[PDB]
Design an enzyme around this catalytic site. Sequence first.
Site, PDB file in Angstrom:
ATOM      1  N   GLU A 294       0.791  -1.125  -0.125  1.00  0.00           N
ATOM      2  CA  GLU A 294       0.186   0.010   0.012  1.00  0.00           C
ATOM      3  C   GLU A 294       0.757   1.184  -0.037  1.00  0.00           C
ATOM      4  O   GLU A 294       1.831   1.312   0.675  1.00  0.00           O
ATOM      5  CB  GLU A 294      -0.650   0.048   1.201  1.00  0.00           C
ATOM      6  CG  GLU A 294      -1.953   0.876   1.502  1.00  0.00           C
ATOM      7  CD  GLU A 294      -2.610   1.042   2.653  1.00  0.00           C
ATOM      8  OE1 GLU A 294      -2.515   0.233   3.561  1.00  0.00           O
ATOM      9  OE2 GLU A 294      -3.778   1.690   2.646  1.00  0.00           O
TER      10      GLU A 294
ATOM     11  N   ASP B 180       9.335  -1.768  16.443  1.00  0.00           N
ATOM     12  CA  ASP B 180       9.873  -0.797  15.969  1.00  0.00           C
ATOM     13  C   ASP B 180       8.998   0.511  15.695  1.00  0.00           C
ATOM     14  O   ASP B 180       8.948   1.266  14.771  1.00  0.00           O
ATOM     15  CB  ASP B 180      10.687  -0.909  14.708  1.00  0.00           C
ATOM     16  CG  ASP B 180      11.912   0.151  14.550  1.00  0.00           C
ATOM     17  OD1 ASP B 180      12.132   0.861  15.489  1.00  0.00           O
ATOM     18  OD2 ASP B 180      12.315   0.181  13.487  1.00  0.00           O
TER      19      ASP B 180
HETATM   20  C1  LIG Z   1       5.978   7.431   1.840  1.00  0.00           C
HETATM   21  N1  LIG Z   1       4.813   6.552   1.525  1.00  0.00           N
HETATM   22  C2  LIG Z   1       5.123   5.121   1.652  1.00  0.00           C
HETATM   23  N2  LIG Z   1       4.128   4.511   1.296  1.00  0.00           N
HETATM   24  C3  LIG Z   1       4.169   3.033   1.780  1.00  0.00           C
HETATM   25  C4  LIG Z   1       5.509   2.522   2.100  1.00  0.00           C
HETATM   26  C5  LIG Z   1       5.820   1.126   2.017  1.00  0.00           C
HETATM   27  C6  LIG Z   1       7.022   0.692   2.540  1.00  0.00           C
HETATM   28  C7  LIG Z   1       7.203  -0.557   2.569  1.00  0.00           C
HETATM   29  C8  LIG Z   1       7.508  -0.999   3.956  1.00  0.00           C
HETATM   30  C9  LIG Z   1       7.708  -2.398   4.400  1.00  0.00           C
HETATM   31  C10 LIG Z   1       8.181  -3.204   3.119  1.00  0.00           C
HETATM   32  C11 LIG Z   1       8.738  -4.630   3.552  1.00  0.00           C
HETATM   33  C12 LIG Z   1       7.611  -5.677   3.491  1.00  0.00           C
HETATM   34  C13 LIG Z   1       8.350  -7.105   3.983  1.00  0.00           C
HETATM   35  C14 LIG Z   1       9.625  -7.178   3.739  1.00  0.00           C
HETATM   36  C15 LIG Z   1      10.477  -5.853   3.790  1.00  0.00           C
HETATM   37  C16 LIG Z   1      11.935  -6.219   3.734  1.00  0.00           C
HETATM   38  N3  LIG Z   1       9.873  -4.775   3.547  1.00  0.00           N
HETATM   39  C17 LIG Z   1       7.998  -2.905   2.031  1.00  0.00           C
HETATM   40  C18 LIG Z   1       7.552  -1.536   1.766  1.00  0.00           C
HETATM   41 CL1  LIG Z   1       7.286  -1.169  -0.010  1.00  0.00          CL
HETATM   42  C19 LIG Z   1       8.043   1.647   2.711  1.00  0.00           C
HETATM   43  O1  LIG Z   1       9.325   1.477   2.363  1.00  0.00           O
HETATM   44  N4  LIG Z   1       7.714   2.967   2.360  1.00  0.00           N
HETATM   45  C20 LIG Z   1       8.692   3.795   2.446  1.00  0.00           C
HETATM   46  C21 LIG Z   1       9.216   4.014   4.196  1.00  0.00           C
HETATM   47  O2  LIG Z   1      10.744   4.558   4.084  1.00  0.00           O
HETATM   48  C22 LIG Z   1      11.155   4.526   5.409  1.00  0.00           C
HETATM   49  C23 LIG Z   1      10.132   4.879   6.461  1.00  0.00           C
HETATM   50  N5  LIG Z   1      10.605   4.334   7.684  1.00  0.00           N
HETATM   51  C24 LIG Z   1       8.703   4.171   6.207  1.00  0.00           C
HETATM   52  O3  LIG Z   1       8.162   4.434   4.850  1.00  0.00           O
HETATM   53  C25 LIG Z   1       6.320   3.770   2.133  1.00  0.00           C
HETATM   54  N6  LIG Z   1       6.255   4.854   1.853  1.00  0.00           N
END
Ligand SMILES: CNc1ncc2cc(-c3ccc(-c4cccc(C)n4)cc3Cl)c(=O)n(C[C@H]3OC[C@H](N)CO3)c2n1
Length: 263
Positions: free
Chosen positions: A87, A131
């Site tokens: 999402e 976390d």
């Molecule tokens: C700015 N909008 C926005 N919307 C949505 C997501 C979603 C994720 C996400 C989370 C976790 C994972 C994930 C799932 C399973 C395993 C593993 C290894 N990673 C995969 C993604 Cl795709 C994301 O990385 N970000 C960016 C992030 O940057 C670091 C911060 N701490 C949180 O957001 C998002 N940002």
Amino acid sequence: TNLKADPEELFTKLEKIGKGSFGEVFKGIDNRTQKVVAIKIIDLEEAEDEIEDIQQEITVLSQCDSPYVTKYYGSYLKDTKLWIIMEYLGGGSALDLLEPGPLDETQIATILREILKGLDYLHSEKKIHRDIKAANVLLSEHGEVKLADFGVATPFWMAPEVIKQYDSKADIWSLGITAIELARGEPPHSELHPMKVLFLIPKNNPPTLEGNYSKPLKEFVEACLNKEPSFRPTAKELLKHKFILRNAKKTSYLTELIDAHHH
Ligand SMILES: CNc1ncc2cc(-c3ccc(-c4cccc(C)n4)cc3Cl)c(=O)n(C[C@H]3OC[C@H](N)CO3)c2n1
């Protein structure tokens, strides 16, 4: 975790929206629906013992079905790269929304309340987020507040018992630190070397919220930040805390915070 489907065909990868755990994250388009998604791309040749942590986070996310937890849509393996589709939340993280200036206590209480709804969900499912912090709290463009980036099963938000090696009450401590972070912009001890903080959290009295903040907010923080985990309230109980009840308002009001951030 589909192995025949090709993710270049299914998604259009757009700009990077930050570095997450284990790989780069991109804004992307689901070509079938045109919905915006977040795409994490992990190079599995570059991952040593991390692959087990990656799989464990996928499993946990796949078991969550809550409006307060970022939804997981699936994963794909293309040559050496794992694509993880989630999402997309266009409001950014709560940490991002601190940049223009301080939050007021209505905004703080609203964000804390929605975090508590997520924690109430997770703990009722016998899960620990591990976390909780402002950078891991994501907002939709409508102001909905969701949890992201679960910790694997930096020390500033860690409960003392986690550092000394615990249960769901560790999330409540982290929430207290997050409350301070939302009020002040940064967690206690943020000026100090992380290895100093590793021994200070166990050794020191718990942090308190300092400054001209309401006594209910200071008491919310104190209740979360007890060295004794059994003395910390549950997320259910904290949802009834006077700070939450007297200050939290509709989440749609948080769109003003999101617009202020895109000033
Ligand atoms: C700015 N909008 C926005 N919307 C949505 C997501 C979603 C994720 C996400 C989370 C976790 C994972 C994930 C799932 C399973 C395993 C593993 C290894 N990673 C995969 C993604 Cl795709 C994301 O990385 N970000 C960016 C992030 O940057 C670091 C911060 N701490 C949180 O957001 C998002 N940002």
